[PDB]
Amino acid sequence: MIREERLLKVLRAPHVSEKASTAMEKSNTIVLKVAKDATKAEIKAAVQKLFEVEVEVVNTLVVKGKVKRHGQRIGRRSDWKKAYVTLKEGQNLD
Amino acid sequence: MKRTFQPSVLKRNRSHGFRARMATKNGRQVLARRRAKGRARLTVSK
Amino acid sequence: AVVKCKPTSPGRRHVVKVVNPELHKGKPFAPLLEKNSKSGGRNNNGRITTRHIGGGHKQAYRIVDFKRNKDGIPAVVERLEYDPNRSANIALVLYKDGERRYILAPKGLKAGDQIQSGVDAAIKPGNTLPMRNIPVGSTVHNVEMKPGKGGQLARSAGTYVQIVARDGAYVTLRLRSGEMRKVEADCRATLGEVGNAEHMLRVLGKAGAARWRGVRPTVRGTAMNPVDHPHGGGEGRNFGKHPVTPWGVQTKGKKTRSNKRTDKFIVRRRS
RNA sequence: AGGACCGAACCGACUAAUGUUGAAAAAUUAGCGGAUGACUUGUGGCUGGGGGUGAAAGGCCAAUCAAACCGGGAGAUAGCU
RNA sequence: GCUCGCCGGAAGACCAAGGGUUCCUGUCCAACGUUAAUCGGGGCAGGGUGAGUCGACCCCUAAGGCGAGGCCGAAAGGCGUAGUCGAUGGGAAACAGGUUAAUAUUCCUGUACUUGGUGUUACUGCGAAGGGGGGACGGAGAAGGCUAUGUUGGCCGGGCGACGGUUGUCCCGGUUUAAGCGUGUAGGCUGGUUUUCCAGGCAAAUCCGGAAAAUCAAGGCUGAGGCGUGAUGACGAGGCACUACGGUGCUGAAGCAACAAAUGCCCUGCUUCCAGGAAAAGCCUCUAAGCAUCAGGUAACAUCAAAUCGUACCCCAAACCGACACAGGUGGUCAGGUAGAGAAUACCAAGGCGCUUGAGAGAACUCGGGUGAAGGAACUAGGCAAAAUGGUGCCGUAACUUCGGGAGAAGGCACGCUGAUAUGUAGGUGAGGUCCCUCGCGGAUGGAGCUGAAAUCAGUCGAAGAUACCAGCUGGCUGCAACUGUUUAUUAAAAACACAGCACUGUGCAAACACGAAAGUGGACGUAUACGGUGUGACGCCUGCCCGGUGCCGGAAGGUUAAU
Ligand SMILES: [Mg+2]
Ligand SMILES: [Mg+2]
Ligand SMILES: [Mg+2]
Ligand SMILES: [Mg+2]
Ligand SMILES: [Mg+2]
Ligand SMILES: [Mg+2]
Ligand SMILES: [Mg+2]
Ligand SMILES: [Mg+2]
Ligand SMILES: [Mg+2]
Ligand SMILES: [Mg+2]
Ligand SMILES: [Mg+2]
Ligand SMILES: [Mg+2]
Ligand SMILES: [Mg+2]
Ligand SMILES: [Mg+2]
Ligand SMILES: [Mg+2]
Ligand SMILES: [Mg+2]
Ligand SMILES: [Mg+2]
Ligand SMILES: [Mg+2]
Ligand SMILES: [Mg+2]
Ligand SMILES: [Mg+2]
Ligand SMILES: [Mg+2]
Ligand SMILES: [Mg+2]
Ligand SMILES: [Mg+2]
Ligand SMILES: [Mg+2]
Ligand SMILES: [Mg+2]
Ligand SMILES: [Mg+2]
Ligand SMILES: [Mg+2]
Ligand SMILES: [Mg+2]
Ligand SMILES: [Mg+2]
Ligand SMILES: [Mg+2]
Ligand SMILES: [Mg+2]
Ligand SMILES: [Mg+2]
Ligand SMILES: [Mg+2]
Ligand SMILES: [Mg+2]
Ligand SMILES: [Mg+2]
Ligand SMILES: [Mg+2]
Ligand SMILES: [Mg+2]
Ligand SMILES: [Mg+2]
Ligand SMILES: [Mg+2]
Ligand SMILES: [Mg+2]
Ligand SMILES: [Mg+2]
Ligand SMILES: [Mg+2]
Ligand SMILES: [Mg+2]
Ligand SMILES: [Mg+2]
Ligand SMILES: [Mg+2]
Ligand SMILES: [Mg+2]
Ligand SMILES: [Mg+2]
Ligand SMILES: [Mg+2]
Ligand SMILES: [Mg+2]
Ligand SMILES: [Mg+2]
Ligand SMILES: [Mg+2]
Ligand SMILES: [Mg+2]
Ligand SMILES: [Mg+2]
Ligand SMILES: [Mg+2]
Ligand SMILES: [Mg+2]
Ligand SMILES: [Mg+2]
Ligand SMILES: [Mg+2]
Ligand SMILES: [Mg+2]
Ligand SMILES: [Mg+2]
Ligand SMILES: [Mg+2]
Ligand SMILES: [Mg+2]
Ligand SMILES: [Mg+2]
Ligand SMILES: [Mg+2]
Ligand SMILES: [Mg+2]
Ligand SMILES: [Mg+2]
Ligand SMILES: [Mg+2]
């Protein structure tokens, strides 16, 4: 059993996107911004517990941070992690 | 023409990297000089 | 059989092959093989210690019985094989108990002959018995220097050692160089000359045949600069100096033996 | 069969012209040599400076070599400008 | 958007290395861009990289590195045992179609596969850090069998022609389909099987190896491709409709045969040669201690798991190495048509470009080319450079020679197209059909159909038929070096180095020698038919005299002579 505190610190935010809206309406897949050290089992357990909903599969990818220039000083945004969580058919989420 | 720098990260880190410097006595003196001078990038190693 | 090649090309003009049709035309015996990694003439410091070595064909090592310890048990000779590691051909023998080994092939040895080590062995080419059991005046090879150490003398393709005397614990040998040396009379020796006597009758014909054997080219010393060699230098071809090594040691005639430990074992030097 | 022949890839660099504040701190164009061999190439490794390596030109060792580079002795010394 | 031109064994496509968001969309034009710029690899904002099967990680080791102890060394430290790292190599498994502005063998649809688990059920010798097998290995060459792929025909759909003709022996386009599973073929290798015994494999062994005897010649292993299924599917020319004119939705014909055919596959094969061609694990098996009815083993079934990291984009390039958006350099993979021996070369397809200043004019001069009267090296240091030769087949071909060569010597003839032989031949392929069978992916016979050189004869056209690109100038005397090779990266490619060969000399093995204060290591897991050094430098005929000087070797009677 994965602890509930970790399950509360795994998920960061939902990711709004044209691709996220397409996968949500077609494949019934939500797109989440997750913690960087979070694994697929921790994500599947978190969505299955905190939302009480049935997860079919989780695909993950790491998003590399961009290099920006505030004024003339260079800088780099953070690497973050993105999860495609495919819900089972019939399941629904706000 | 073929110029003298043909990069390879593996050979770069095996030759000039952190653990290659920390392996020997004189390489540890290299890292002590760069810390005293205050280098931002202390070695090659990314 | 030496075969002069027909001159269809320079590099085949002067080639003499040594063709032996009795050698096995197949793979060697796999358990007796091991890896023989090349050196390039470079020691553990990586520097070149011995020059002119490098390249050549990959060579697997053949484990050869020089100690020859299977006493009493007779062995039949299974087949003759090529060894790239040495000038002499090797013989794959099969003991009665089921062990196979490689020995140096003697002159007249062929497939199907019986060999036997030990003291009570007969005296035919192939047997190995101590030289207090060997008659004076016979030609042996694969001769031990110390008892049980393994054979070290007369291992190259056509060599042999004569036994000229025996005084108790020692026998006096006539080595292939002409040196008369005392060896203990308990050291094993193998009867007969070593096989491939016409090995020296080959002619390589071209430079690549030496590069196949891992012999890099030798730059003669006077073709250098004086920083490189003592012979180097000159405006034209000049050699007004005595021939030395690259390290300044006289070569034409100067002796270099400085071992006072083994001087009691040397009866007469070579002439 | 061949350190065989002709000839592309590939490796090299014999001749001429251009260019010489170049397209290029050595190249282009037209020809040229080898092209199954002592061939060539990728990756990784080893050899360290009076030392390496060198089919040997004092050649090469990061566009630097009759003794690399960097830091230090060091503000060497300079009857010389 | 219509035309034109260029590449097309690349100037197309896919990657590794390397770079690191350069990817896509919106917006901006100050700077950057060798001009303008509304554009951009530029600025700004947002979005984008989805894996049990790809790769890494991981199991394994090579060269080599590190190295407990250890040995050695003023110190630092050097070497190295047990070990542990280390790919560029070995090791389980996924294919097709569809889709996004940007990802896909990653998502979706469909169909598979592998390795681990737990759990039952049947069965019952399990067990290794050990033994054995396997993994597991070279070069060259020859065919044969295939496929990728292409061409033609058939088939289906459409068309009937801006200018003479074109319902036909006419034109255009399409004719696609995988992994897996089953079959086990061409072909390659191999004698099987049973029992007994055994100084071997560090002990053991039922395993391997070796001895016997008996029986059976016929069992086994490997194996491309094909065929069947996958697939009543998907894809599919086109249509039918809406249409933000971008698109979105619906529907969907035929989907066959022959020939040619790879540098790819069978092939880690076969033949042959000498220069004699990695290791370890996974995998299979044998037993050791141990366990004794428990553990574990395999067999089926169920269930669970297969994590983590990379995945955008360039990759020959404007994104890599060159200071540049630099005519340079950069490893691997794919390899269409016509002609052609060909991956050369010419023109094209797919696809991608027109090289980030243009517009005129049409001086000298320079650059790169084209042609040239008569002469033809008189130019010049020198035929430098240009020009010329150039292909296939046949005839023919000198001195000399190491008998191989020289030699493609030199020199010369033919070459297009049409018709006939023969409405397309010889040859290749090989169907129907028939027959046989120990029956199939079978064996004969059979010749349909397809493909298809070359030659002779006759005719005909042009100035010219190897018509373009492509593509040897030849010969004579002579010096040097035998040759192939190598060399001054960046003014010297040579007669210089090397070379095979020859000779001298050292070296008896703890070898000489060399690198190392040393331990040690190379020589060499070699042993005088070996190794090192030196000189000469294929081959042929040869290599003469001098030991006084300088070296080296040998001598040990005398003289001299160190520390002590
Ligand atoms: Mg991933
Ligand atoms: Mg040598
Ligand atoms: Mg020599
Ligand atoms: Mg030489
Ligand atoms: Mg010189
Ligand atoms: Mg000197
Ligand atoms: Mg002179
Ligand atoms: Mg003189
Ligand atoms: Mg050749
Ligand atoms: Mg050129
Ligand atoms: Mg050629
Ligand atoms: Mg000089
Ligand atoms: Mg340099
Ligand atoms: Mg120096
Ligand atoms: Mg100096
Ligand atoms: Mg001073
Ligand atoms: Mg000064
Ligand atoms: Mg346009
Ligand atoms: Mg074109
Ligand atoms: Mg081309
Ligand atoms: Mg940017
Ligand atoms: Mg863009
Ligand atoms: Mg403006
Ligand atoms: Mg501008
Ligand atoms: Mg931009
Ligand atoms: Mg692994
Ligand atoms: Mg390992
Ligand atoms: Mg190791
Ligand atoms: Mg220690
Ligand atoms: Mg060590
Ligand atoms: Mg690898
Ligand atoms: Mg893309
Ligand atoms: Mg084993
Ligand atoms: Mg091979
Ligand atoms: Mg086909
Ligand atoms: Mg018309
Ligand atoms: Mg008309
Ligand atoms: Mg058609
Ligand atoms: Mg199938
Ligand atoms: Mg991609
Ligand atoms: Mg490109
Ligand atoms: Mg440009
Ligand atoms: Mg460029
Ligand atoms: Mg082509
Ligand atoms: Mg003009
Ligand atoms: Mg002209
Ligand atoms: Mg004209
Ligand atoms: Mg003229
Ligand atoms: Mg005219
Ligand atoms: Mg004229
Ligand atoms: Mg003249
Ligand atoms: Mg004149
Ligand atoms: Mg000329
Ligand atoms: Mg010309
Ligand atoms: Mg002369
Ligand atoms: Mg020459
Ligand atoms: Mg040459
Ligand atoms: Mg060169
Ligand atoms: Mg030069
Ligand atoms: Mg030159
Ligand atoms: Mg040694
Ligand atoms: Mg000479
Ligand atoms: Mg003489
Ligand atoms: Mg003398
Ligand atoms: Mg003397
Ligand atoms: Mg004296």
Residue numbers in the entry:
A (entry chain S): 1 to 94
B (entry chain c): 1 to 46
C (entry chain C): 2 to 272
Show the paper's wording.
As a model protein, we have chosen the cold shock protein A (CspA) from Escherichia coli, which is a major regulator of the transcriptional response during cold adaptation in many bacteria. It consists of 70 amino acids (aa) that form five β‐strands connected by loops. Here, we combine biophysical methods with cryo‐EM structure determination to show that folding of a β‐barrel protein begins with formation of a dynamic α‐helix inside the ribosome.
The cryo‐EM analysis shows the CspA70 nascent chain attached to tRNALeu at the PTC as it traverses the tunnel and emerges at the exit port. We obtained two structures of CspA70 that differ in the conformation of the nascent chain. In the more stable conformation (CspA70‐1) the whole nascent chain backbone is traceable. The C‐terminal part of the nascent chain forms a short compact module within the contact range with PTC nucleotides G2061, A2062, G2505, U2585‐U2586 and, to a lesser extent, U2609. Residues A751 and A1614 of 23S rRNA contact the nascent chain in the upper part of the helical module, whereas several residues of the extended loop of L22 (Arg95, Arg92, Arg84, Lys83, Gly91, Ala93, and Ile85) pack against one face of the helix. At the opposite face, nucleotides A507–A508 establish interactions with the distal part of the helical density. The spatial constraints imposed by the tunnel walls disfavor β‐structure formation; density that can accommodate a structured β‐hairpin is observed only upon reaching the vestibule, as more space for chain rearrangements becomes available. The structure is partially stabilized by the interactions with 23S rRNA nucleotides A63, G93‐U92, and C1335‐A1336, as well as by weak contacts with the protruding loops of L24 and L29 at the exit port.
